[PDB]
Amino acid sequence: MASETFEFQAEITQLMSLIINTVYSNKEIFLRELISNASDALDKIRYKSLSDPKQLETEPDLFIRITPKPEQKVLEIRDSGIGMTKAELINNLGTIAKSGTKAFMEALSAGADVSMIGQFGVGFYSLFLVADRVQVISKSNDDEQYIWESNAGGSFTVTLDEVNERIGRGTILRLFLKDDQLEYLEEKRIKEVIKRHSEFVAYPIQLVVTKEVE
Amino acid sequence: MASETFEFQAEITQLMSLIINTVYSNKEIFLRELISNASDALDKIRYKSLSDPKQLETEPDLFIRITPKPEQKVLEIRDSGIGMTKAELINNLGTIAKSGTKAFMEALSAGADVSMIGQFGVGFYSLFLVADRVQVISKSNDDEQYIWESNAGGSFTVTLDEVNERIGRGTILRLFLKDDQLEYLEEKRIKEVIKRHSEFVAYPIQLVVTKEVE
Numbered sequence: 347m348a349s350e351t352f353e354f355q356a357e358i359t360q361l362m363s364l365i366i367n368t369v370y371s372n373k374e375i376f377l378r379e380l381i382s383n384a385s386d387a388l389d390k391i392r393y394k395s396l397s398d399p400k401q402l403e404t405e406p407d408l409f410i411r412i413t414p415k416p417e418q419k420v421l422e423i424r425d426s427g428i429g430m431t432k433a434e435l436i437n438n439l440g441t442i443a444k445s446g447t448k449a450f451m452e453a454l455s456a457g458a459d460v461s462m463i464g465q466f467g468v469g470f471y472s473l474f475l476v477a478d479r480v481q482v483i484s485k486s487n488d489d490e491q492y493i494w495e496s497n498a499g500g501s502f503t504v505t506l507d508e509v510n511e512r513i514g515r516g517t518i519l520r521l522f523l524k525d526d527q528l529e530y531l532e533e534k535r536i537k538e539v540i541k542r543h544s545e546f547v548a549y550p551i552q553l554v555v556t557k558e559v560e
Numbered sequence: 561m562a563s564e565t566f567e568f569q570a571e572i573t574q575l576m577s578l579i580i581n582t583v584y585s586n587k588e589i590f591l592r593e594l595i596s597n598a599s600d601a602l603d604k605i606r607y608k609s610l611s612d613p614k615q616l617e618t619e620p621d622l623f624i625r626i627t628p629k630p631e632q633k634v635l636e637i638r639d640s641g642i643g644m645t646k647a648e649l650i651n652n653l654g655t656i657a658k659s660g661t662k663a664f665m666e667a668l669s670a671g672a673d674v675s676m677i678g679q680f681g682v683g684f685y686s687l688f689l690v691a692d693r694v695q696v697i698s699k700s701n702d703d704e705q706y707i708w709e710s711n712a713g714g715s716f717t718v719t720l721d722e723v724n725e726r727i728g729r730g731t732i733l734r735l736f737l738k739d740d741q742l743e744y745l746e747e748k749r750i751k752e753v754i755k756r757h758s759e760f761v762a763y764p765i766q767l768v769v770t771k772e773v774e
């Protein structure tokens with residue numbers, strides 16, 4: 347199909363503009379937030395499967411997978427968690443997506459460290475520390491695969507997905523990294539960031555590395 | 561769109577049935593043939609770009625990339641070479657695809673080693689040594705992305721591609737490995753097979769490895 351365009355709730359647009367523009371030092375913290383969200387989605391599908399085991403069959407493996415795509419300056423973070431339907435992507439990432447958004451911004455003004463973002467329920471938006479564009483590609487058992495896309499402007503698009511690999515079930519965050527943040531494409535940097543901030547994750551974290559054979 | 565189905569030329573079906581069923585020992589040779597085809601397609605796009613440099617811009621990097629997908633028992637061999645349009649996939653892989661096909665089978669009967677397959681121009685079909693199903697996904701600058709699929713039966717299908725990652729330009733052979741050939745998903749096995757049979761390749765060969773972070 348065509349893309350549909352949606353307006354963000356005003357506090358969300360304010361949160362994003364602030365973060366995409368910040369000179370804050372500790373940007374690496376975006377990866378902890380995206381692994382935590384990935385781990386929550388995997389919790390929800392595992393929890394859901396307790397009474398409905400067939401929900402697992404669209405993707406029996408439970409994992410988080412990180413894929414640097416250095417040639418496109420993209421970093422992907424995939425999970426096989428519960429995924430979001432079209433209406434979920436629309437509601438959860440932007441149109442309500444509310445709640446701690448304004449509390450967080452107020453805490454920032456008073457000097458809170460950008461790293462509390464997650465305790466306010468809005469750590470998804472920390473991706474704009476290292477990316478100036480994101481596509482969230484998601485497949486819920488309840489809906490077709492969709493793409494939600496934002497560039498931290500006041501509106502986002504949602505498009506039926508006829509261009510990306512089929513996710514059996516779950517979500518890919520595809521981060522279009524800023525030119526100064528290309529370090530997050532490097533295998534050593536990634537590992538160091540995960541060991542530091544994500545020690546207790548119930549699910550395997552996989553890193554997809556491309557090496558020339560010689 | 562829907563799938564279209566096409567009949568193979570009769571000698572091709574005869575070639576495939578023989579190979580999918582052979583007890584021959586040296587199956588590893590399929591990888592040399594698929595890297596050679598990949599290298600030929602990259603030669604043709606490089607040669608073509610000599611007088612039409614813009615043909616490179618849909619994918620400026622020239623590479624061969626091998627991606628084991630152990631969970632699906634798939635091995636992928638990708639190149640960014642010239643790719644095939646729908647009519648090319650139909651003509652080149654099956655409906656004419658002729659020429660050395662019958663000569664090769666006659667040489668086999670007389671005791672030729674399955675490994676001469678490439679000097680008869682039909683080494684593509686060597687994939688059926690290790691796979692009982694293949695999808696060829698291809699994107700020519702001249703056409704949309706298409707999927708050609710065969711299971712060594714007498715007919716194949718060609719489908720407009722709305723399910724796979726976008727190839728900028730080139731071809732993916734997606735091999736659905738036989739249960740006894742899963743060794744070709746292993747990083748050490750692959751490297752050993754390339755060093756042995758593909759020493760002189762002008763293009764980088766990349767191996768995509770997935771490792772758990774601990």
Ligand SMILES: CN1CC/C=C/CCCCCCC(=O)Cc2c(Cl)c(O)cc(O)c2C1=O
Nearest residue numbers: 380383384386387425427429430438470517
């Ligand atoms: C958590 N859920 C599953 C759906 C989440 C439902 C609760 C509302 C969450 C609001 C924030 C959005 C979110 O966490 C979605 C998500 C993100 Cl951002 C991610 O990086 C990885 C994911 O697997 C998901 C996701 O699909």
Ligand SMILES: CN1CC/C=C/CCCCCCC(=O)Cc2c(Cl)c(O)cc(O)c2C1=O
Nearest residue numbers: 594597598600601639641643644652684731
């Ligand atoms: C060689 N060409 C480019 C298109 C080839 C034209 C000449 C006719 C070739 C007939 C065999 C089919 C073929 O080689 C196609 C192909 C295969 Cl099988 C492959 O494994 C990788 C590829 O990049 C190609 C391909 O697209």
